């Protein structure tokens, strides 16, 4: 079909940051979470 028919991007509702893959974001949320 197309090289990028659907270019879904993961956005962070914490710092309004976008990523390439899901994990990329999930891992980032680490710095967002508190009470480590
Ligand atoms: Zn964030």
Summarize the annotated binding site for Zn(2+) as residue ranges. 12, 15, 28, 32
Angstrom distance (rounded) from CA 3 to CA 32: 33
Angstrom distance (rounded) from CA 4 to CA 27: 24
Give the technique used to solve this structure.
NMR
Is-contact 28 19, C-beta < 8 A?
yes
Q: For residue 1, how far is its CA from the centre of ligand 1 (angstroms)?
A: 33
Give residues whose Cβ lies within 5 Å of ion ligand 1. 12, 14-15, 17
Residue 30 tokens read as 């680490």
Residue 11 tokens read as 């956005």
CA nearest to 16, candidates 25, 5, 7: 25
Q: For residue 2, how far is its CA from the centre of ligand 1 (angstroms)?
A: 30
Distance (Å) of CA 10 to CA 4, 26, 27, 31, 36: 15, 9, 12, 16, 24
Is-contact 25 12, C-beta < 8 A?
yes
The pairs formed by 4-13 with CB atoms below 8 angstroms and a separation of 24 or more are none
Is-contact 12 6, C-beta < 8 A?
no
Number of H helices, E strands in the chain: 1, 2
What is the residue whose two structure tokens read 């680490």?
A: 30
């Amino acid at each position: 079909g197309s090289s990028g028919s659907s270019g879904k991007i993961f956005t962070c509702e914490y710092c309004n940051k976008v990523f390439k893959f899901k994990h990329s974001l999930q891992a980032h949320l680490r710095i967002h979470t508190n009470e480590k």
